[PDB]
Amino acid sequence: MASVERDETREHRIETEIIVDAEDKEERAMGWYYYLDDTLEFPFMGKWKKKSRKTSTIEEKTVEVLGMAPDDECLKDMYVEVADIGGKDDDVYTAKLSDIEAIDVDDDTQEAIADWLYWLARGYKF
Numbered sequence: 001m002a003s004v005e006r007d008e009t010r011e012h013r014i015e016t017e018i019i020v021d022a023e024d025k026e027e028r029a030m031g032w033y034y035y036l037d038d039t040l041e042f043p044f045m046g047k048w049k050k051k052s053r054k055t056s057t058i059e060e061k062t063v064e065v066l067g068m069a070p071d072d073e074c075l076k077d078m079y080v081e082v083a084d085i086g087g088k089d090d091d092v093y094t095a096k097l098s099d100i101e102a103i104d105v106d107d108d109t110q111e112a113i114a115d116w117l118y119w120l121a122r123g124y125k126f
Contacts, residue, residue, distance in 0.1 A: 005122040026075050029074060030074075033074045033078065041109045042109075045062070045103050045105070047103060062085050063086065063100070079097065081094055
């Protein structure tokens with residue numbers, strides 16, 4: 001198994017603390033989104049560890065992460081708005097938080113981002 005998480009305590013806690021009011025994946029995406037955006041000490045920065053190359057190799061684009069994307073896009077994945085400080089610098093795009101590594105951010109922001117990544121790797125249940 002992935003073993004990124006291996007004890008059910010975090011699954012019981014998140015169930016009883018973050019998505020108590022939600023019973024379907026669309027609602028639970030909004031539960032995740034709400035607390036995550038409220039926890040992100042945005043704006044911040046990261047590296048977009050983009051795997052989408054033709055060779056499927058990782059590529060690393062330095063980005064300023066403006067905040068979460070519109071909630072309407074985030075019904076399925078925790079998207080974030082990003083500016084290409086590693087390239088274009090003067091324009092903005094959207095990225096999967098799932099495809100980013102946060103840099104030089106506050107501990108509670110880094111932990112929220114890490115916990116999304118760990119959850120997603122442990123299983124995309126919602």
